[PDB]
């Protein structure tokens, strides 16, 4: 193909969007933005498929062009805007705020947060570099650049950005005993305490994470996102607290819920 592609097929779209195989040939190709194509959630998917606020893409367009949706405190009118991990979606007309946080099944949840929690977010620092008269710069997972970071912040750490100002307020080091989410791979959406890190020079480091329920798993270092200091998260967790139940336990819980409900 010559030049960039501009379409995304319905069946070739990311699976975690949970799209049909009969409601059209195309899936909304997310715009270029702070998050990768396969790791984002387009605004049209969130407003139409998730929140049911629209029944068509035209209604999503109307909602977005009335300037009602803020992403990280800034109004976005792009219906294919790539919203991703740790982002904040504010709808002041209905007075709600959501955070984009993975379920244990690896899918972005509809996780409502308080209006005072929507004033900040967490960003994993992807790199730190000194430029142009020795000014340190930091690049996070939102592709946002922060000048003059704390000289203690290193790669793989987490920083709490104030959305109003864009400045760093606090940070969590990447160390054992710290809480972390998994943002990719088979264990995507799981939360647990870092127990170990195997360094593999010239290759991918492997980080071992222990669940709150004693379960253990491993991921690549790029798939780890430090959520809180110690075992206390700095953000509100979804319904499941990052505990991946086996299929049997999920079936048992569903049967208990059926018994209690009908």
């Amino acid at each position: 193909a010559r030049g960039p592609k501009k379409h995304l097929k319905r069946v070739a779209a990311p699976k975690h969007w949970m799209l049909d195989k009969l409601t059209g040939v195309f899936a909304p190709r997310p715009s270029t933005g702070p998050h990768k194509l396969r790791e984002c959630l387009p605004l049209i998917i969130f407003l139409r498929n998730r929140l049911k606020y629209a029944l068509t893409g035209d209604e999503v367009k109307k909602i977005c062009m009335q300037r009602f949706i803020k992403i990280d405190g800034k109004v976005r009118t792009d219906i294919t805007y790539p919203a991703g991990f740790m982002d904040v979606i504010s709808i002041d007309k209905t007075g709600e705020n959501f955070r984009l946080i993975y379920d244990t099944k690896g899918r972005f949840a509809v996780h409502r947060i308080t209006p005072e929690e929507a004033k900040y977010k967490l960003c994993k620092v992807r790199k730190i570099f000194v430029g142009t008269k020795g000014i340190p710069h930091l690049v996070t997972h939102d592709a946002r650049t922060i000048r003059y970071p704390d000289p203690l912040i290193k790669v793989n750490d987490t920083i709490q950005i104030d959305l109003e100002t864009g400045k760093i307020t606090d940070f969590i080091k990447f160390d054992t005993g710290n809480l972390c989410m998994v943002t990719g791979g088979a264990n995507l959406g799981r939360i647990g305490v870092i127990t170990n890190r195997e360094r593999h020079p010239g290759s991918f480091d492997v980080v071992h994470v222990k669940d709150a329920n004693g379960n253990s798993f491993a991921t690549r270092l790029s798939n780890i996102f430090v959520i809180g200091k110690g075992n206390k998260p700095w953000i509100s967790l979804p319904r499941g607290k990052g505990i991946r139940l086996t299929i049997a336990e999920e079936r048992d819980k569903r049967l208990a819920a059926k018994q209690s409900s009908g």
């Binding site: 340190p136 000048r147 003059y148 704390d150 000289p151 203690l152």
Partner: peptide
């Protein structure tokens, strides 16, 4: 904004290196 950020980072950096020098001196002594 450039002036304010430079001054604030100079202050923070000076405090960081003072703490680092204190830890280094105390590690050397013990």
């Amino acid at each position: 904004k450039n002036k304010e950020e430079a001054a604030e980072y100079a202050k923070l950096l000076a405090k960081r290196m003072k703490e680092a020098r204190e830890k280094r001196q105390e590690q050397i002594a013990k």
